[PDB]
Fold mKalama1.
Amino acid sequence: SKGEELFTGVVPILVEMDGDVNGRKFSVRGVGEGDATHGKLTLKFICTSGKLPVPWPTLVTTLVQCFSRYPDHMKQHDFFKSAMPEGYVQERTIFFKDDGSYKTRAEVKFEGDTLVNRIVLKGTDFKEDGNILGHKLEYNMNVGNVYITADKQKNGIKANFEIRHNVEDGGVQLADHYQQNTPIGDGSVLLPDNHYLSVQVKLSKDPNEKRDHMVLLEFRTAAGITPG
Ligand SMILES: [Cl-]
């Protein structure tokens, strides 16, 4: 890409989320930076409406796959950078097993030299004493492997993956993700062969921060195609 030229160094990131779960409105802002040459990004998120009504880990996938590192033999398969700077709309539906669902729509694009992820999330039908509204999930994140394929119905790509959220005192809460990304521009974008993004996340807290928050470190690598 010429889009890939925009990712040769550290890129600042701004994330904004307007959320609503079972009618309860909330907002999140995140700031940080990503470096695709290191397949790494770091973000700190604050709940800018007080206390978060769902567990932080359930929002990780919603809250910039542009920073995945594609190896040389897979560069032709990086849709995300190819769509830049005009960007793409990412839509997901996330189904929490035996509980409610999130519907998300985000625009990801450069605004000047900052990458911006602007999100609206709406969650419906959650159980008041379920794992989500009840805050019964551990503060951590398991590895996710996002399987990407060309979308033959709309312009761009689709993906499917399931996230396992550890539940306090044992067991898991599954979150089944459906994803579509559609370029914003009219310009040509790369159409990838099937592959996946392997994503590892470490969640932490800022010892000096009294607001409800999440510090995220994330490593993301493309794979699923043997070298050559
Ligand atoms: Cl267990």
The longest strand covers residues 24-35.
